[PDB]
């Protein structure tokens, strides 16, 4: 983020204190456009060298913040923003972030020496970088509650409680207070739980060994570590206190908590004096914070030495934690409710205008008129609204946890509107285990193949190349490492034995030892090893890489002419194949290369030896999930780095690419490299599917920008994709306004997961920080679960909107109808209606889960859609008609009359007006809940969640019992009894008529009649995504 800054000290003690002693009212006003509010009161102008209050000025940012400056100990002026420290430097006369001496301005020589820091005073290093800990703040209950109890909604609720108390409506005020307290408790619990769960991810404290200049040693706590300090890895122990660079020795770590992959990763000592150092160059020579150490070996001497380079939030996990906690925006925002709220507000305004008009006709005193008029606007805003909403997210998260998906959440609703998904091939769409079908000897005989053979008999460079070209290690009493290396070593039958210090057991010629090793990285598809055995003239070198890459990394004469056909035959069958190569590596070059640690020299003029053939089968759950996802018109795309033929075969097996397919290849020598197209198996078939290679996608995006947009739309199989290209592909797809989610397993695609709208990890076992979503089950069947849960949550939220609006308007209309005559509902009646009937039903409404199968129809877009408003208005017409009919029916019977213009106060409540209206409205409050809560395409039937049905039945039974002329609970509580037996036959008949009419109307509106009418004359809507979608019609 880019932004300038400015600051100045406080205004000198004087008029400002006294003026904003009174000017505290505009606090709510300044919540919008806060820059002027801080310019007043606090901020004068000052030079940019003695600032205390520090504020930002935009360069690309749109928000605003103010910061506090602190000095310690040169007084070291500094300030912290978003967890990043900034320190004033005299030479530059500007604030500088704490990254000096890092990011390529220090070389491997000074870094290499950099020993023991110094027996210096603690001020210089500790103060600048601070304590080494990722401090997630904690707050006390009084400190926490003030952050949400000051919202304008709760201020208005307090105003209402004050208003009702002045009117002697004691009971209703208590109900409002209880509901507000419940809402506050729910929000506080949510915030506390989220903060606590995030805090657990941060590691705990411990103490390590740290050396000092000379020969001294120390046993200090981890909190005292600072950059430049050298520490010794303890007893091959556990977690890494902080990021550090390995200067001496070799070890391996488990980076599942940071990269999401549980496969052990080898690390090697940092080369000396090569050049400037950086995280990218340090990837295979550094240890990241929060990563376990499995085994460490002392190359030479009694210690394995690492040098700390980053501490606190600056560490690798610190940035991920900051990005987890601080956020920026989904860009699928929901700012569409303002106009619906305005539409509701205009009705409220006209209703209160009518109330104040008619209320004057009753000659009510000049003071009682205004309070009773204000009561209308007071009741329009529905209490418990925040409570019904904070609980929906809790329900969704709890249900997701129950199924083994651990979401970090605002993306629950986002995941329900996915339209394109990316998948990896190995591990994700297929089995992790690998079966070896043998090797193809190529070490002679006119370069001709010797036919595959699953053997271990012959002795030669190929056998020991297989036996030693790996990075296996012994943990406890079993080997651990890459499954592919384990399977290869199993085929040979050689056993890993417990300068080189690693050797193979089986000794047909003689036992073999490994002098040097180069670990793998996803950027380059190869690994190297230096091997020596007794009696050898000089050590040899063996490498293992992708067949295509190594085929071009060896002597051109050695590789056979028909290598392409040989590689295509096995790959086209669905096998996963590799290649092996070896180098004579003469004596002096062999000795110097290992000493100098230069990798380029070893991976030079090699000689191809053979190919390993592996069998990798699809997971049984892969095909049904893909078929179900694709049936609902959701695009599925394969992003893989494997060979293109194998990826195409797997995609065909998975069910993808049913119709014709085509290939685009890099075969062109012209400087622009015009890309030809070939039919996998002439006109331009618009039903074609496109498959691209890594370099092909890398050059097309560069040289043919305008051909790219209609290639991504049709691309299905991406092969030989580099780890950085996956993120590029994900970002490019989003430029088409796509909503892309990705499911990845390996560590190479960690960056792609972050870029995607929703990222799901399959092999991970906890709610880590790498991806927003983590799946404990190693299968792709979780994506449909996420999609269905998201759409169900969205539908539940819309239903909550509708029910809350209906209840608010119903209460408003009932109160106004009472106002038309001369009477008001009793305070106890309001307490009942609000606290019990509305709240218990609203809170329990969101319990029902998602449907068992996905549907073609997508969830609703916005509230302003004609069907929602039309249904609301029709339901209100029905409700008001029912209420007015019930009211008018009473006049037929001999019923006396209320003492209008005699008392005209809420003390004559024992009358026939409030009784019937209350009885009819109480039933409607429950009837409306069922009508709108009903669901099918996205939610399970209403009778699925037992508690909601039980509560509805209990409330309906209680109300019906009340109606059926009891001698109790109906007289003392401001209700009037009637001897005529019109309850069962007529009043309940009208209630049932309302019930059936509302449900029939809701069914009619649910059916496609309202939507089909809107289809005329055109169909296009105002949503901008349709503008990009229509381009597919022109592109196909
Ligand atoms: N020992 C090895 N270490 C690393 N990569 C290897 C090794 N042997 C072969 N490879 C090659 O790595 C190439 C691609 O690297 P990458 O890590 O992207 O493969 P991958 O992880 O199998 O891809 P995917 O995740 O799609 O399966 C593959 O062609 C594979 O043959
Ligand atoms: Mg994988």
DSSP state of 943: G
**Ligand with minimal distance to 718 CA:** 1
Rounded distance between C-alpha atoms, residue 717 and residue 689, angstroms: 9
Judge if 879 and 968 occupy the same domain. Answer: yes
Closest CA to 603 of 530, 543, 525, 520: 543
Q: Say if residues 499 and 516 touch (Cβ distance below 8 Å).
A: no
Query: Tokens 């190297």 identify what position?
Result: 528
Q: How far apart are CA 308 and CA 397, in angstroms?
A: 39
Task: Give 207's strand partners.
Answer: 221
Q: What is the spatial distance between Cα 785 and Cα 799, in angstroms, rounded to a whole number?
A: 21
Report which ligand 1 atom has the smallest distance to the Cα of 578. 31
**Could you check whether the bond before residue 348 is cis, i.e. omega within 30 degrees of 0?**
no
What is the rounded CA–CA span in Å between residue 886 and residue 172?
26
- Check pocket membership of 613 for ligand 1, CB cut-off 6 A: no
Distance of CA 96 to the CA centre of its chain: 32
Q: 66 with 38: CB under 8 angstroms?
A: yes
Q: How far apart are CA 575 and CA 650, in angstroms?
A: 10
Q: How far apart are CA 828 and CA 164, in angstroms?
A: 12
> Which distant-in-sequence residues (6+ apart) come within 8 Å of 967 by Cβ?
none
Q: How long, in residues, is the chain? A: 1036
Whole-number Cα distances in Å, 851 to 129, 331, 780: 52, 27, 18
Identify whether residues 718 and 811 lie together within a single domain: no
Q: What angle is formed at CA 421 by the lines to CA 418 and CA 422, rounded to 5 degrees?
A: 155
Catalogue the long-range contacts made by 167-172 (C-beta closer than 8 Å, 24 or more residues apart): 167/371, 167/375, 168/827, 169/827, 169/830, 170/827, 171/827, 171/828, 171/830, 171/831, 172/827, 172/830, 172/831, 172/834
Instruction: Report the CATH number at residue 633.
Output: 3.40.50.1000
C-alpha 95/C-alpha 265 separation (Å) is: 39
Residue 464: CB atoms within 10 Å: 23
- Residue 753 near residue 774 (C-beta atoms within 8 A): no
Q: What is the DSSP string of 120-173?
A: --SHHHHHHH--S--------HHHHHHHHHTSHHHHHHHHHHHHHHHTT-HHHH
Q: How many A from CA of 232 to the centre of ligand 2?
A: 34
The answer to whether residues 821 and 954 belong to one domain is yes
Q: Which ligand number lies closest to the CA of residue 723?
A: 1
Q: Sign of the CA dihedral 415, 417, 422, 424?
A: positive
Q: Tell me the two tokens of residue 759.
A: 């990222």
308 and 367 in a single domain? The answer is no
Inter-CA distances, 692 with 526, 676, 846, Å: 22, 12, 45
**Residue 519, token pair as written in the block:** 């670990």
Ligand 1 lined by 471 (C-beta under 6 Å): no
Assigned domain for 126 exists: no
Q: Residues at the annotated binding site for Mg(2+)? A: 745, 749
Query: Rounded CA gap, 380 and 349, in Å?
Result: 10
One-character DSSP codes across 53-80: EEEEEESS-----EEE-B-------EEE
Give alpha helix (H) positions in 403-457.
411-414
**Contact criterion met (CB below 8 Å) for 964 and 984:** yes
- Can you give the C-alpha Rg of the chain in angstroms? 37
Quickly list H helices, 403-473: 411-414, 461-468
Both tokens assigned to 616:
């990798």
Contact 760, 778 (CB under 8 A): no
What is the separation of C-alpha 624 from the centre of its chain, rounded to a whole number of angstroms? 26
* Technique that determined the structure: cryo-EM
Q: 578 CB less than 6 Å from ligand 1? A: yes
Instruction: Produce one character per residue of 190-208: b if its CB has 16 or more CB atoms within 10 Å, e if not.
Output: ebeeeeeebeebebeeeeb
Last residue of a domain, one of 756, 777, 803: 756
Q: Which own/partner contact pairs does 459-465 have at CB distance under 8 Å and 24+ positions apart?
A: 459/508, 459/509, 461/540, 461/542, 461/582, 461/609, 462/580, 462/609, 462/610, 463/492, 463/508, 464/504, 464/512, 464/531, 464/533, 464/542, 465/531, 465/542, 465/544, 465/580, 465/582, 465/609
Q: Distances in Å between the alpha carbon of 902 and those of 781, 823, 905, 907, 973?
A: 72, 12, 9, 11, 22
Give alpha helix (H) positions in 326-438: 338-361, 368-380, 385-402, 411-414
Q: Which two tokens stand for residue 63?
A: 């928000």
996 C-alpha vs ligand 2 centroid, how far in Å? 56
Q: How far is CA 20 from CA 16, 25, 44, 383, 661, in A?
A: 6, 9, 15, 33, 72
Signed CA dihedral, 842, 843, 844, 848: sign only: positive
- Which DSSP symbol is given to 426? I
Q: Could you please report the per-residue DSSP string of 360-386?
A: HHTT--TTHHHHHHHHHHHHHSPTTHH
Range of the domain at 804: 330-407+786-1014
For 342-345, the CB contacts below 8 A with 24+ separation are 343/869, 344/805, 344/808, 344/809
Residue with tokens 């409607």: 924
Spell out the residues 6+ positions from residue 30 whose beta carbon is closer than 8 angstroms to its own. 36, 37, 38
Residue 640 beta carbon below 6 angstroms from any ligand 1 atom: yes
The CA 697 to ligand 1 mean position distance, Å, reads: 19
* Strand ranges, E, within 737-777: 740-744, 758-761, 773-775
What phi, psi does 294 have (nearest 5°)? Answer: -90, -45
Indicate which residue's Cα is closest to atom 8 of ligand 1.
545
Domain boundary among 291, 325, 359: 325
Inter-residue long-range contacts of 37-43, CB under 8 Å, 24+ positions, other chains counted: 38/66, 41/11, 41/16, 42/10, 42/11, 42/16, 43/8, 43/11
- 980 carries an active-site annotation: no
Q: Alpha carbon of 992 to those of 441, 503, 988, 997: distances in Å?
A: 85, 86, 6, 8
Separation of alpha carbons 733 and 584, rounded Å: 47
The CA distance from 802 to 999, in Å, is 15
CA 905 vs CA 161, 364, 373: distances in Å: 20, 10, 14
Strands 635-639 and 576-583: unpaired
Give the domain CATH number at 821. Answer: 1.20.1110.10
| CB within 8 Å of 159: residues ≥ 6 apart | none
Chain breaks in the chain (C to N over 2.5 A) after: 73, 327, 408, 498, 681
Q: Tell me, using a 6 A CB cutoff, whether residue 642 lines ligand 1.
A: yes
Q: State whether 904 and 953 are in the same domain.
A: yes
The secondary structure element, H or E, covering residue 820 is: helix 782-820
Give dist(CA 1014, CA 934) in Å, integer: 23
Tell me the C-alpha distance between 150 and 127, whole Å: 37
* 3-state secondary structure (DSSP) of residue 1025: helix
Token couple for 809: 């308007």
Cβ(774)–Cβ(767) below 8 Å: yes
What's the distance, CA 672 to chain centroid? 40
Query: Two tokens at 758?
Result: 């929703």
**CA angle centred on 957, ends 956 and 958, rounded to 5°:** 90
CA count, 13 A, side-chain hemisphere, 125: 19
| Continuous segment of H or E residues that includes residue 88 | strand 84-89
Separation between Cα atoms, residue 1009 and residue 468, nearest integer Å: 72
Inter-residue contact 440 to 611 (CB < 8 Å): yes
Shared-domain flag, residues 392 and 519: no
Distance from the alpha carbon of residue 424 to the mean position of ligand 2, in angstroms = 6
Closest residue by Cα to residue 896 from 880, 883, 915, 919 = 915
List, in sequence order, the alpha helices (H) in 202-337.
Answer: 256-259, 279-282, 316-325
For 182-203, give the secondary structure using H, E and C.
HHHHHHHHHHHHHHHHHHHHCC
Q: How many Cβ atoms sit within 10 Å of the Cβ of residue 142?
A: 7
CA triplet 838, 382, 27: central angle to 5 degrees? 145
The answer to whether 792 and 774 are in contact (CB under 8 A) is: no
Q: Judge whether 435 and 491 are in contact, CB under 8 Å.
A: no
Same domain, 313 and 171: no
**Same domain (yes/no): 978, 882:** yes
Q: Is 426 in the pocket of ligand 1 (CB under 6 A)?
A: yes
Q: Which of 229, 375, 424, 757 is catalytic?
A: 424
Q: Which of 821, 811, 847, 1016 is nearest to 925 (CA)?
A: 811
Under a CB-based contact definition with an 8 Å cutoff, are residues 579 and 551 in contact?
yes
Within a domain: 413:
no
Place of tokens 């960056």: 751
* 254 in Cβ contact with 239 (< 8 Å): no
Q: Are residues 570 and 675 in the same domain?
A: no
Tell me if 553 sits within 8 A of 581, measured CB to CB: yes
Q: Based on the domain organization, do 994 and 925 belong to the same domain?
A: yes
**Max CA separation in the chain (angstroms):** 122
**Structural domain count of the chain:** 6
Residue 520 in contact with ligand 1 by CB distance below 6 A: yes
Count CB neighbours of 965 within 10 A.
15
Strand pairing class (3-8; 53-58) = antiparallel
Do the domain assignments include residue 478?
A: no
For residue 446, give both structure tokens.
Answer: 């006119």
For residue 694, report the distance from its CA to the centre of ligand 1, in Å.
14
Determine whether the shortest distance from the Cβ of 546 to ligand 1 is under 6 A. Answer: yes
Query: Beta partners for 495?
Result: none
Has residue 234 been placed in a domain? yes
Question: Considering the domain boundaries, does residue 862 fall inside one?
Answer: yes
Nearest to 42 by CA among 10, 64, 5: 10
Q: Is residue 774 part of a domain?
A: no
Label residue 45 exposed, middle or buried (CB < 10 Å: 0-12, 13-18, 19+).
Answer: exposed
C-alpha torsion sign, points 761, 765, 770, 771: positive
Could you give the strand order of the β-sheet that contains 740-744, starting from the edge strand earlier in sequence? 405-407, 773-775, 758-761, 740-744, 420-423, 635-639, 715-719, 689-693, 661-664, 677-679
Q: Which helix (H) or strand (E) holds 990?
A: helix 988-1006
Mutate which of 543, 642, 717, 750 for ligand 1 pocket (most atoms within 8 A of beta carbon): 642
**Residue that is written with structure tokens 């406890």 in the block:** 476
Residues 316 and 344 in one domain: no
Q: What's the start-to-end Cα distance of the chain, in Å?
A: 39
Q: Whose CA is nearest to atom 9 of ligand 1?
A: 545
Which of 800, 862, 812 lies closest to 340, judged by CA? 862
User: Among the three residues 325, 358, 375, which one is the final residue of a domain in this structure?
Assistant: 325
Does some domain include residue 1036? no
* 36 class by beta-carbon count within 10 Å (0-12 exposed, 13-18 middle, 19+ buried): exposed
- Asked if residues 594 and 515 have their Cβ atoms less than 8 Å apart, the reply is yes
The CA distance from 880 to 817, in Å, is 9
Is the CB of residue 427 less than 8 Å from the CB of residue 576? Answer: no
- Do 804 and 917 fall within a single domain? yes
Q: Relative to the CA of 722, which ligand 1 atom is closest?
A: 18
Q: Whose CA is nearest to atom 24 of ligand 1?
A: 426
> Cα 1007 vs. chain centroid, distance in angstroms?
35
Q: What is the DSSP letter of 581?
A: E
In a domain, 1024, yes or no: no
Q: Look up residue 528 and give its DSSP letter.
A: E
């Amino acid at each position: 983020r880019l932004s300038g800054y400015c600051g100045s000290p406080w205004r000198v003690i004087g008029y400002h204190v006294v003026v904003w002693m009174m000017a505290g009212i505009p606090l709510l006003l300044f919540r919008w456009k806060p820059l002027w509010g801080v310019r007043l009161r606090l901020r004068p102008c000052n030079l940019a060298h003695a600032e205390t209050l520090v504020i930002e000025i935009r360069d690309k940012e749109d928000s605003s913040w103010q910061l506090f400056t602190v000095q310690v100990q040169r007084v070291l002026r500094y300030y912290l923003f978003q967890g990043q420290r900034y320190i004033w430097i005299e030479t530059q006369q500007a604030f500088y972030q704490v990254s000096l001496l890092d990011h390529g301005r220090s070389c491997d020589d000074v870094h290499r020496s950099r020993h023991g820091l110094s027996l210096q005073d603690q001020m210089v290093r500790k103060a600048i970088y601070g304590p080494n800990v990722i401090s997630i703040p904690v707050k006390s209950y009084p400190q926490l509650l003030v952050d949400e109890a000051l919202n304008p909604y709760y201020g208005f609720q307090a105003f209402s409680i004050a208003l009702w108390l002045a009117d002697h409506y004691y009971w209703y005020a208590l109900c409002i207070f209880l509901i507000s307290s419940i809402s506050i408790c729910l929000s506080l619990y949510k915030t506390r739980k989220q903060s606590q769960t995030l805090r657990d991810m941060v590691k705990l404290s411990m103490r390590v060994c740290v050396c000092r200049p000379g020969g001294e040693e120390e046993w200090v706590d981890s909190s005292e570590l600072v950059p430049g300090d050298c520490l010794v890895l303890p007893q091959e122990g556990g977690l890494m206190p902080c990021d550090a660079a390995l200067v001496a020795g070799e070890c391996m770590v488990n980076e599942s908590s940071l990269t999401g992959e549980s496969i052990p990763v080898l690390k090697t000592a940092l080369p000396e004096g090569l050049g400037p150092y950086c995280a990218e160059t340090h990837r295979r020579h550094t240890l990241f914070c929060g990563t376990l150490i499995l085994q460490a070996r002392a190359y030479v001497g009694p210690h394995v030495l690492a040098v700390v380079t980053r501490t606190g939030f600056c560490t690798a996990k610190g940035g991920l934690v900051s990005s987890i906690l601080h956020p920026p925006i989904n860009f699928k925002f929901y700012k569409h409710s303002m106009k619906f709220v305005a539409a509701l507000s205009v009705l409220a305004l006209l209703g209160t205008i009518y109330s104040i008009f008619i209320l004057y006709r009753n000659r009510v005193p000049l003071n009682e008129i205004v309070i009773r008029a204000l009561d209308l606007v007071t009741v329009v805003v529905p209490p418990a609204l925040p409570a019904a909403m904070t609980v929906c997210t809790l329900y969704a998260q709890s249900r997701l946890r129950r199924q083994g998906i651990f979401c970090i959440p605002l993306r629950i609703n986002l995941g329900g509107k996915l339209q394109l998904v990316c998948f990896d091939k190995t591990g994700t769409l297929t089995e992790d285990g690998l079966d070896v079908m043998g090797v193809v000897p190529l070490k002679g005989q006119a370069f001709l193949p010797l036919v595959p053979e699953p053997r271990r008999l012959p002795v030669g460079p190929l056998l020991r190349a297989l036996a030693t070209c790996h990075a296996l290690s012994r943990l406890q009493d079993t080997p651990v490492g890459d499954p592919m290396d384990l399977k290869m070593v199993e085929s040979t039958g050689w056993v890993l034995e417990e300068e080189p210090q690693l050797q193979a057991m089986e000794e047909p010629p003689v036992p073999v030892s490994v002098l040097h090793r180069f670990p793998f990285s996803s950027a380059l598809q190869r690994m190297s090893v230096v091997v020596a055995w007794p009696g050898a003239t000089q050590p040899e070198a063996y490498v293992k890489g992708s067949p295509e890459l190594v085929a071009g990394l060896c002597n051109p004469e050695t590789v056979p002419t028909d290598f392409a056909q040989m590689l295509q035959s096995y790959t086209a069958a669905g096998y996963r194949v590799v290649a092996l190569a070896s180098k004579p590596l003469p004596t002096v070059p062999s000795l110097e290369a290992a000493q100098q640690l230069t990798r380029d020299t070893v991976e030079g003029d090699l000689s191809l030896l053979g190919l390993l053939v592996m069998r990798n089968l699809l997971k049984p759950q892969t095909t049904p999930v893909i078929q179900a996802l694709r049936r609902t018109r959701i695009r599925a795309v394969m992003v893989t780095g494997d060979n293109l033929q194998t990826a195409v075969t797997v995609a065909r097996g998975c069910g993808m690419v049913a119709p014709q397919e085509h290939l685009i290849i890099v075969h062109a020598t012209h400087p622009e490299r015009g890309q030809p197209a070939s039919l996998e198996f002439e006109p331009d078939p618009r039903s074609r599917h496109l498959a691209l290679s890594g370099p092909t996608f890398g050059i097309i995006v560069k040289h043919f920008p305008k051909l790219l947009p209609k290639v991504l739309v049709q691309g299905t199989v991406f092969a030989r994709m580099a780890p950085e290209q996956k993120t590029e592909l994900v970002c490019e797809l989003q430029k088409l306004q796509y909503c892309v989610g990705m499911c990845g397993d390996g560590a190479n695609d960690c960056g792609a997961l972050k870029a995607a709208d929703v990222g799901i990890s399959l092999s991970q076992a906890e709610a880590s920080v790498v991806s927003p979503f983590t799946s404990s089950m190693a299968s792709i069947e979780c994506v449909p679960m996420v999609i269905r849960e998201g759409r169900c949550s969205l539908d539940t939220s819309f239903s909550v909107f509708k029910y809350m609006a209906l209840y608010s308007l119903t209460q408003f209309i009932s109160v106004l109808i009472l106002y038309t005559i001369n009477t008001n509902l009793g305070d106890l009646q309001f307490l009942a209606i609000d606290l019990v009937i509305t709240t218990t039903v609203a809170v329990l409404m969101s319990r029902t889960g998602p449907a068992l199968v996905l549907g073609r129809v997508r969830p609703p877009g916005a509230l302003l859609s004609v069907p929602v408003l039309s249904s609301l208005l029709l339901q209100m017409v029905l409700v008001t008609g029912v209420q007015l009919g019930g009211y008018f029916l009473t006049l037929a019977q001999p019923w006396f009359v209320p003492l209008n213009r005699t008392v005209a106060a809420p003390d004559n409540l024992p009358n026939y007006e409030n009784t019937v209206v209350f009885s009819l409205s109480s039933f409607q409050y429950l009837i409306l809940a069922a009508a709108v809560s009903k669901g099918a395409p996205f939610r399970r039937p209403l009778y699925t969640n037992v508690p909601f049905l039980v509560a509805l039945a209990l409330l309906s039974s209680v109300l019906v019992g009340l109606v059926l002329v009891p001698g109790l609970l109906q007289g003392p509580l401001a209700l009037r009894n009637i001897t005529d037996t019109g309850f069962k036959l007529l009043l309940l008949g009208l209630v049932t008529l309302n019930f059936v009419g509302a449900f029939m109307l809701e069914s009619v509106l649910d059916q496609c009649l309202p939507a089909c009418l809107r289809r005329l004359r055109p169909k296009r809507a105002s949503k901008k995504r349709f503008k990009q979608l229509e381009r597919e019609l022109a592109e196909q």
